[PDB]
């Protein structure tokens, strides 16, 4: 399976099937982020993708080609998060992202909490367009989560 | 040994729930690209 479309990243070595994070695969490639498999390889049916570029700096990685995903947030709108929780279905969330500042410029954030094992989830412009992984974030004064919205080059 | 099979489209709900508000944070991106908070 290389459809384009949003896959669930799964595992064996622990206490029966556990969903250890997210991916999209667009134009051949498997986009997810590198916590989820620490860059080992993965498995498709028959098939298996290995990795192709990946940087932890970024948590970023891609399989079985370069990163192909290159939108990104116009700023203004706000956009959806297409999470893929563990043992649930795909679901919509839209948002109006806020900001990390950064000493190198401003990344997109999502606030948004969501278990362990939906790193990885894209998320979307109004257009479609898959704009960043959701995943590597904060933890706030609250307690609750907010994710960078991270894309590649 | 990881596996991946397939969980939905990628296509923008126009009934999606709406949630979250708009932060914005000064954070750190280390080497190790864990972000923490300034
Ligand atoms: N925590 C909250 N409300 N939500 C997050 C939402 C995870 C969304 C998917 N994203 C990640 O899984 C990534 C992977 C690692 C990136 C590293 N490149 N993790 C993170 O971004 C942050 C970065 C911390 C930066 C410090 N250096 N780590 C955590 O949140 C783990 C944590 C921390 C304190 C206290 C706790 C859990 C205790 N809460 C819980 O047990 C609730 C169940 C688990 N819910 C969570 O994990």
């Keep these: 399976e290389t459809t ?51 940087d932890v700096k970024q948590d970023l990685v891609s399989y079985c080609g370069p990163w192909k995903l290159d939108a990104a947030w116009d700023g203004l709108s706000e956009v959806q998060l297409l999470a893929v929780p563990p043992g649930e279905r795909a ?25 362990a094992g939906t790193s990885g989830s894209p998320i979307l412009d109004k257009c479609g367009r898959v704009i960043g992984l959701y995943g590597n974030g904060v933890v706030i004064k609250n307690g609750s989560y907010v994710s960078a919205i991270t894309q590649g080059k | 040994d990881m596996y991946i099979e ?33």
């Design chain 2, 6 to 38: 397939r969980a939905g489209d990628i296509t923008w709900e126009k009934d999606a729930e709406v949630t979250g508000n708009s932060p914005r944070l000064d954070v750190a991106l280390d080497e190790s690209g864990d972000f923490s908070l300034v």
């Design chain 1, 91 to 115: 679901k919509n969330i839209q948002t109006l992202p806020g900001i990390f500042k950064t000493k190198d410029g401003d990344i997109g954030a999502v606030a948004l909490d969501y278990p």
């Design chain 1, 4 to 54: 384009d479309g949003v896959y669930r990243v799964m595992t064996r070595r622990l206490l029966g099937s556990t969903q250890v994070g997210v991916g999209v695969m667009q134009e051949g490639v498997f986009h997810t982020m590198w916590h989820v498999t620490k860059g080992a390889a993965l498995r498709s049916g028959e098939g298996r993708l290995d990795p192709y570029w990946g």
